[PDB]
Amino acid sequence: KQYQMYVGGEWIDASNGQTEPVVSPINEEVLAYIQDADASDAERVLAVATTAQKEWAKQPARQRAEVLRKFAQLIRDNKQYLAELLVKEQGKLLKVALGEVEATSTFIEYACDWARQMDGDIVKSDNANEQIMIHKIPRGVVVAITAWNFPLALAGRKIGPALVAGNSIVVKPTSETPLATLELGYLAEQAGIPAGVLNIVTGGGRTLGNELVGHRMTNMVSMTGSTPAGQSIIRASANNMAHVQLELGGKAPFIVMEDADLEQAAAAALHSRFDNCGQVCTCNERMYVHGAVYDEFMRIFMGKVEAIKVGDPMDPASDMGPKVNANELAHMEELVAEAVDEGATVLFGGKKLEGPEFEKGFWFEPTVLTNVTQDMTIVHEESFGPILPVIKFDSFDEVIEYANDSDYGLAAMICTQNMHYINRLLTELESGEIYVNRGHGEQHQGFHNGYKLSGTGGEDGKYGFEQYLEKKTFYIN
Amino acid sequence: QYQMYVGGEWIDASNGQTEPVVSPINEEVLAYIQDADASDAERVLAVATTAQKEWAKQPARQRAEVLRKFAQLIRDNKQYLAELLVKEQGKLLKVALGEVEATSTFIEYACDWARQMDGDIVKSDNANEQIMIHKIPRGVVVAITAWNFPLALAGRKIGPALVAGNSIVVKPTSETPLATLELGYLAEQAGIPAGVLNIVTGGGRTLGNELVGHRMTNMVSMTGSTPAGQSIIRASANNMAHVQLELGGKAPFIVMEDADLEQAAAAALHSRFDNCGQVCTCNERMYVHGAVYDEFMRIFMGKVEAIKVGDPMDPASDMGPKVNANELAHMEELVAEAVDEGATVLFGGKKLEGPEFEKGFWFEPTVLTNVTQDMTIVHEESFGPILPVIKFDSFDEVIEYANDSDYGLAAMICTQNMHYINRLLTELESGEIYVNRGHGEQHQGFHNGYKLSGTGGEDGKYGFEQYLEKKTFYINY
Ligand SMILES: NC(=O)c1ccc[n+]([C@@H]2O[C@H](COP(=O)([O-])OP(=O)(O)OC[C@H]3O[C@@H](n4cnc5c(N)ncnc54)[C@H](OP(=O)(O)O)[C@@H]3O)[C@@H](O)[C@H]2O)c1
Ligand SMILES: NC(=O)c1ccc[n+]([C@@H]2O[C@H](COP(=O)([O-])OP(=O)(O)OC[C@H]3O[C@@H](n4cnc5c(N)ncnc54)[C@H](OP(=O)(O)O)[C@@H]3O)[C@@H](O)[C@H]2O)c1
């Protein structure tokens, strides 16, 4: 099977003859080939997107919302096909995959509610017989770049707001897991999305993606991915000063205070690390446990970790599937060996799975490291896998300083029944997305917003949607 | 000789370095300033970070009252600060009095947003859960200013930054810092706590570059040339500070066939030759419909020939000097290049001659005619009293001409045709549009540039809110 690219309502090949394979993490089966365009394909799809946007913007916002609501429902109609495709290309549990498809639909349906919230401002002038008008208008062409952990939902997360607001979009999905995203091309056509309003091109992030983000025709970049790629895009955007909405890496601490409910805290900590095989940007990446509850907490928590069943993600008994590819599995092995080198203990796991049920695929054991000090690399380098270091602490001010000792500042989780600890978080905890007495997991109406190198400018909600519009100011005498 | 205002104290550059400040009127050395390099960035950032922690705890009404007092002290010393602006920058005295006033009203206007910082209570999809989105200060703001209105640009940024609970590190232009440095004295007089307002002087490419990329810089608000802003965007990859950058312009001034010619001629005259062309919204290319060209030009050239160039303290002067020798040479180079490309020097085009102008940097009001759209003077920002004039035949043509540009800040159009004015909203790629009047924006507006004219905009509601960060809480009960 070989996919094409969706450009201007047609299916076309990369102008270089290049393809790229897509490999299942479950069994290393080559699932399909995709086009592997390079920088020379950017201008065509941007020009097509530019032309289509002029007509799309003229459509009443209510019609745009009606088309996208149909698009989102067509996605829901094909939930089972798309979920099984996500399981095969990306490796997530089937039940998580079904949840990702639903989130794709709801990300689009949530944005449709903003179809009627684009009013401008009538501003009173200091000068007589004069009016100041501040209109909201589309930016034009949005470039949307996605990551592989939730590729389909990350696309809907950006398609929805961009098209509702009257923009056209050029989606460059991750090259690791683009197949389900490419299938949206056919549903876009079924829903009646006009030709060129939704484009899907596949190719190298550092070639095609880099050409798209700095291009003259690109008015906005919405991108999800690692911090180094986001930094490259920031540099590129100096060439066009396109608005950049970049949602990048995390190193979320999970803090268990002395007065936490240990059973609630342990279950929240368990899911927050091992959801999606650790491949969540809000994951519990470093667990801080107060020394007074350490022993009792860890006995509860470790009983949970040791019962995680790693297996085939179509098997309903599986609690954790494979890692997405060999590069990411190698990263697990290197983080573990390096942590042993700097003095840490491997309490559980810490190796790739052995045995007949796992000779194909990229399988890593749920891993807990102890005797970890704050300065070890595993406390600072994002893991994005099932590796959890555990650090003791003795006071709030101590763990706060640990929490902020980071280049990342996306998620943070804390379990405590002390309301004054929680109130100090507003001014003292340098994370943009804070969970109190529960695990990670954001909502469409929230604001997914990362401090420091976790991004520059948030996503979702009203403050995410508002970034897909531009302003135009009129001084009218 | 001036020092730098850091942490409530006055100190020298840690290198031994100083830099002269020269009057454009007579080339008199006015003062020496500190010429600090990158090695002074950390220290001023450290005391700003410390001072912000206590500043943000003050009730917002108290911060507004301190800033209101700061704004009135600036007004109290209007005559001293205006004459200082005249000597260091060369603007006309009455414009200098206006700039001082706009410095105070920039701050006073920002004090009105002191009670417009409410967060959001957001209904959760889950029972017994609350989503809270708080608005908080960003932290340390770095403020970089340009030389054409140095004191107002400072106040345009000091006002919103400090009202919102940030601290500020102001790096003024090295060409014209003196009046800006005087603010340090007034900040002590007003009771601004030590370290909330800091003023450091040094090269933008050394000290400024180190300030904008530093880990302690949460936001950059900068005004200046497009190449400098492109350097700041690249540097911001290192910290992902929010960057509010207000860069170059190339504003078209458009005279449609149905324009009130006398009204259009006067608005065009001031829009180009205000502040010797040193305004980012200046009329930089004049498009005149061929059907009114001769009548409009006879009216317009009459007004140009009446411009009196001379001493900016003399109330008879309508235009003062260019700011320095390099900017003056740029005037001579742009004219010579335009002639070599085929333009006519209809008027002016030379350094002023004769005794009375043997000292200082004096250039004549200059009009270039028989210009084609592709000449360099139609594309490269001049920022001086040079005006090319281009014929056109249709609205569609002049929209293409207007948009054929790397800049997209200001635009001016004179017409009676409501259909033309309505088409501007979708077809004219400028963020700040003036209809049947000249340039000049207002504090309640939104000063916003498309393309390489800047990132997000400044002033008003949407400028103020960029000085705030968000924090999202998912609180489970
Ligand atoms: N903060 C959030 O909301 C959020 C949510 C999910 C994931 N993330 C983060 O994203 C990362 C996920 O893994 P990942 O490997 O997919 O991230 P990645 O390697 O940085 O890839 C992200 C995307 O950007 C492209 N890329 C790489 N360089 C680029 C460039 N110079 N210009 C344009 N695009 C470029 C990629 O293309 P190629 O695949 O072709 O290289 C890919 O489509 C993790 O760090 C995770 O924390 C963030
Ligand atoms: N859009 C607006 O609202 C607005 C309003 C007024 C002026 N402008 C523009 O400003 C330009 C003229 O002013 P200007 O000559 O002063 O601009 P400039 O030469 O770019 O200088 C701007 C400021 O930034 C600093 N600079 C230069 N490189 C820097 C860097 N790599 N990092 C940090 N700072 C750096 C400068 O420091 P040093 O000069 O001391 O070395 C200076 O303080 C014109 O193009 C005009 O259009 C824009």
Side-chain angles (χ1 to χ4, degrees):
Chain A
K1 184 163 183 174
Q2 183 167 148
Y3 286 74
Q4 295 185 293
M5 318 191 294
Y6 189 58
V7 173
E10 282 294 54
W11 290 95
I12 70 176
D13 280 2
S15 63
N16 67 20
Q18 298 303 291
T19 61
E20 204 52 47
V22 180
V23 174
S24 185
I26 308 164
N27 55 14
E28 298 183 64
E29 172 196 1
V30 189
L31 292 172
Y33 286 79
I34 67 172
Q35 304 300 300
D36 197 349
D38 58 27
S40 71
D41 274 314
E43 183 177 56
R44 172 177 166 62
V45 66
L46 291 171
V48 152
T50 304
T51 302
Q53 182 279 335
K54 297 203 266 287
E55 305 313 303
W56 178 244
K58 294 173 192 165
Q59 290 203 32
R62 153 263 313 176
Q63 283 193 7
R64 307 203 297 271
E66 174 165 279
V67 180
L68 299 160
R69 279 191 211 280
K70 186 175 181 179
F71 182 50
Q73 183 47 44
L74 288 175
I75 292 164
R76 175 175 295 107
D77 291 343
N78 293 279
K79 180 173 284 170
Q80 191 74 29
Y81 173 90
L82 285 171
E84 295 181 6
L85 185 47
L86 289 172
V87 170
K88 293 203 291 188
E89 70 170 339
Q90 195 270 322
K92 62 170 43 71
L93 306 184
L94 174 53
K95 55 183 170 176
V96 170
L98 298 163
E100 181 180 353
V101 174
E102 181 65 11
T104 312
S105 294
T106 56
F107 267 125
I108 294 163
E109 285 156 351
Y110 181 84
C112 290
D113 287 338
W114 299 92
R116 314 318 294 274
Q117 329 284 345
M118 295 183 269
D119 290 350
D121 309 320
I122 300 170
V123 180
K124 165 96 162 120
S125 180
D126 293 329
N127 302 314
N129 288 324
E130 208 205 50
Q131 202 86 89
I132 298 175
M133 310 261 281
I134 311 184
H135 290 84
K136 315 289 188 49
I137 67 179
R139 295 211 189 258
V141 181
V142 168
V143 166
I145 298 178
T146 65
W148 50 253
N149 64 326
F150 297 101
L152 194 71
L154 294 178
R157 185 181 224 167
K158 304 171 197 302
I159 291 170
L163 266 41
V164 168
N167 306 285
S168 68
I169 198 165
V170 179
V171 184
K172 180 266 161 270
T174 164
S175 303
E176 307 302 332
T177 61
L179 303 185
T181 308
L182 286 164
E183 298 283 345
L184 301 180
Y186 304 110
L187 305 185
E189 184 156 87
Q190 288 199 325
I193 293 170
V197 172
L198 197 161
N199 310 281
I200 307 169
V201 292
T202 50
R206 290 159 175 89
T207 49
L208 169 72
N210 173 69
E211 191 63 19
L212 292 175
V213 291
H215 202 281
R216 162 107 290 166
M217 302 200 260
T218 294
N219 301 106
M220 186 202 178
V221 177
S222 183
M223 171 272 196
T224 295
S226 65
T227 292
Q231 298 178 296
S232 176
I233 292 170
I234 287 167
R235 299 182 191 106
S237 71
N239 187 255
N240 55 1
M241 305 202 186
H243 180 78
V244 292
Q245 178 191 56
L246 310 191
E247 321 300 337
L248 307 167
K251 191 71 191 172
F254 195 105
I255 300 172
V256 179
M257 295 306 298
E258 70 270 13
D259 64 338
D261 184 284
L262 300 189
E263 166 57 54
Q264 173 229 99
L270 192 273
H271 291 72
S272 295
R273 169 30 97 207
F274 297 105
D275 278 345
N276 213 42
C277 189
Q279 300 166 144
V280 192
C281 75
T282 55
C283 259
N284 170 17
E285 283 270 331
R286 44 185 172 128
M287 188 157 60
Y288 294 91
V289 183
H290 192 283
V293 301
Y294 181 89
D295 289 336
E296 183 187 0
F297 173 82
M298 286 296 278
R299 176 162 294 166
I300 298 168
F301 180 81
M302 287 314 291
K304 291 176 159 69
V305 170
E306 298 180 353
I308 291 176
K309 184 187 195 321
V310 189
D312 179 11
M314 294 293 294
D315 185 349
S318 291
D319 304 318
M320 199 176 91
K323 277 204 66 72
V324 73
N325 60 44
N327 287 43
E328 287 277 341
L329 178 68
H331 194 208
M332 303 300 97
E333 302 213 294
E334 312 217 283
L335 293 171
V336 168
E338 175 178 48
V340 174
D341 291 340
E342 299 166 353
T345 293
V346 176
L347 187 58
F348 184 85
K351 59 193 180 302
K352 83 212 328 186
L353 269 72
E354 284 157 290
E357 46 281 89
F358 304 110
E359 162 46 12
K360 290 171 143 190
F362 311 111
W363 303 98
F364 209 67
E365 282 172 359
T367 298
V368 177
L369 311 173
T370 57
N371 302 133
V372 178
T373 56
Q374 173 65 15
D375 64 330
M376 287 177 178
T377 307
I378 196 67
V379 188
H380 296 271
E381 172 170 348
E382 181 181 42
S383 280
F384 219 57
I387 296 173
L388 185 57
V390 190
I391 304 92
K392 283 182 168 111
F393 71 96
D394 305 307
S395 72
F396 184 74
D397 303 331
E398 176 183 9
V399 75
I400 286 304
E401 216 179 309
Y402 292 165
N404 299 339
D405 173 38
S406 179
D407 285 335
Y408 298 110
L410 186 45
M413 288 131 291
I414 182 176
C415 293
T416 178
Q417 293 173 74
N418 182 340
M419 289 308 309
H420 197 216
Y421 289 158
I422 293 165
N423 272 116
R424 294 176 63 187
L425 303 187
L426 175 63
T427 50
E428 297 179 46
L429 187 61
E430 295 163 1
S431 304
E433 199 181 80
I434 300 177
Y435 301 84
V436 179
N437 288 328
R438 47 154 294 182
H440 64 162
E442 71 266 32
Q443 291 174 48
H444 296 355
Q445 60 262 44
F447 194 42
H448 183 75
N449 182 36
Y451 298 170
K452 303 174 175 183
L453 303 191
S454 293
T456 181
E459 201 163 24
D460 296 344
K462 70 155 138 156
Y463 304 116
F465 176 85
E466 93 191 340
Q467 289 175 60
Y468 287 86
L469 296 162
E470 187 48 277
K471 314 229 158 28
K472 184 169 289 178
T473 303
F474 283 87
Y475 295 81
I476 300 163
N477 175 30
Chain B
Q1 188 169 149
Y2 285 78
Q3 293 180 290
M4 312 182 303
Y5 187 64
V6 175
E9 299 297 2
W10 288 95
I11 70 179
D12 290 351
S14 67
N15 67 26
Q17 301 313 294
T18 56
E19 188 71 5
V21 173
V22 179
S23 180
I25 305 167
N26 54 7
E27 288 166 78
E28 156 184 24
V29 185
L30 297 178
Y32 285 80
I33 63 175
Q34 307 301 298
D35 202 354
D37 54 25
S39 62
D40 277 288
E42 203 140 292
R43 168 194 181 172
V44 62
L45 290 174
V47 306
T49 303
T50 306
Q52 187 274 336
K53 280 182 292 126
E54 302 314 311
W55 179 239
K57 289 176 196 170
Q58 299 197 22
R61 55 199 305 285
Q62 160 96 26
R63 304 197 302 262
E65 185 44 60
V66 172
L67 293 164
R68 268 163 181 137
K69 183 170 189 183
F70 183 52
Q72 182 52 43
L73 294 172
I74 295 166
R75 184 175 288 109
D76 287 342
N77 296 275
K78 174 173 296 186
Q79 193 73 31
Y80 176 95
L81 295 171
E83 289 186 22
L84 188 51
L85 283 168
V86 175
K87 297 186 306 257
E88 73 174 329
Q89 192 267 325
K91 54 164 46 73
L92 310 184
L93 174 59
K94 52 191 189 168
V95 172
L97 293 166
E99 164 171 12
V100 174
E101 180 65 17
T103 307
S104 302
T105 65
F106 261 138
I107 294 161
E108 291 158 347
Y109 180 83
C111 295
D112 284 331
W113 299 93
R115 315 306 286 279
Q116 313 308 329
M117 289 185 271
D118 296 339
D120 303 323
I121 301 161
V122 174
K123 178 87 193 82
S124 174
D125 298 333
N126 303 126
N128 292 312
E129 200 183 62
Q130 267 180 327
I131 311 184
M132 311 266 126
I133 311 188
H134 286 83
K135 289 183 169 70
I136 62 175
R138 287 205 182 267
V140 174
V141 173
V142 160
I144 301 182
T145 63
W147 51 255
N148 67 323
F149 298 97
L151 188 70
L153 291 178
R156 172 179 237 171
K157 304 173 195 303
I158 287 170
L162 267 43
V163 165
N166 309 289
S167 64
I168 200 169
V169 174
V170 181
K171 193 226 83 95
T173 171
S174 303
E175 296 282 338
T176 59
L178 305 182
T180 302
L181 284 158
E182 296 286 345
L183 294 185
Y185 298 112
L186 302 188
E188 289 234 332
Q189 213 169 49
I192 297 182
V196 176
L197 196 168
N198 314 274
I199 312 167
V200 287
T201 52
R205 291 198 30 121
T206 45
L207 176 61
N209 172 253
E210 187 75 7
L211 287 174
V212 304
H214 205 279
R215 92 216 190 238
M216 290 189 267
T217 297
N218 304 99
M219 184 196 174
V220 176
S221 181
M222 170 269 185
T223 294
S225 65
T226 286
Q230 294 177 302
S231 155
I232 294 181
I233 292 178
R234 298 180 193 111
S236 65
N238 184 70
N239 59 1
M240 296 188 188
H242 181 80
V243 296
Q244 175 186 58
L245 311 177
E246 301 331 307
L247 312 171
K250 194 70 193 175
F253 192 106
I254 309 172
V255 184
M256 301 305 300
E257 71 278 4
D258 64 344
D260 181 309
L261 300 191
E262 165 65 38
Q263 181 196 50
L269 190 291
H270 310 323
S271 299
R272 161 79 288 180
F273 299 108
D274 279 349
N275 214 37
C276 194
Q278 292 158 159
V279 196
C280 70
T281 59
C282 261
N283 164 207
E284 284 258 342
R285 338 120 68 171
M286 203 181 291
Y287 297 85
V288 185
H289 195 292
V292 304
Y293 180 91
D294 301 322
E295 189 186 347
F296 173 84
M297 282 305 283
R298 254 183 319 252
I299 301 170
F300 182 80
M301 291 316 297
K303 290 164 184 295
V304 174
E305 314 191 76
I307 292 172
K308 182 48 163 211
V309 179
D311 182 5
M313 294 294 302
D314 182 339
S317 296
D318 308 306
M319 199 174 91
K322 285 290 291 173
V323 70
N324 60 28
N326 165 78
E327 282 274 339
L328 180 64
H330 196 218
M331 301 302 93
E332 300 176 300
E333 151 181 20
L334 285 170
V335 171
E337 179 178 58
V339 164
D340 181 32
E341 293 179 357
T344 300
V345 182
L346 184 61
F347 180 96
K350 305 174 310 289
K351 281 169 50 150
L352 270 83
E353 78 198 6
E356 113 145 268
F357 305 107
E358 274 194 4
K359 303 291 221 67
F361 314 116
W362 306 92
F363 202 79
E364 282 168 338
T366 303
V367 186
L368 308 179
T369 44
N370 311 115
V371 182
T372 62
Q373 168 63 15
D374 63 336
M375 293 177 177
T376 303
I377 194 54
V378 183
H379 297 270
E380 175 179 341
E381 186 189 30
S382 61
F383 212 57
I386 306 177
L387 181 65
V389 185
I390 304 93
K391 300 197 171 95
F392 67 96
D393 307 307
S394 66
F395 178 77
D396 283 329
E397 175 188 8
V398 88
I399 288 300
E400 181 188 320
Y401 288 169
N403 295 344
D404 170 28
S405 190
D406 292 325
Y407 298 109
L409 179 46
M412 288 135 291
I413 185 171
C414 290
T415 180
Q416 311 300 112
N417 191 317
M418 291 313 298
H419 189 49
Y420 292 157
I421 297 168
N422 282 321
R423 293 177 56 183
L424 301 181
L425 171 67
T426 52
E427 291 171 56
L428 187 60
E429 311 162 337
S430 284
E432 188 178 85
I433 300 175
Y434 303 86
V435 179
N436 293 331
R437 50 154 289 179
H439 67 156
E441 75 264 22
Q442 288 171 52
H443 296 352
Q444 57 266 46
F446 194 42
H447 186 64
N448 187 38
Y450 301 170
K451 300 183 178 155
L452 310 188
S453 285
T455 57
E458 211 169 9
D459 296 348
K461 171 188 178 185
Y462 304 111
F464 174 81
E465 76 188 357
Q466 299 178 53
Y467 289 87
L468 295 171
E469 180 58 274
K470 289 169 193 80
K471 184 169 288 172
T472 306
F473 285 79
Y474 295 79
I475 302 169
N476 172 45
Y477 291 107

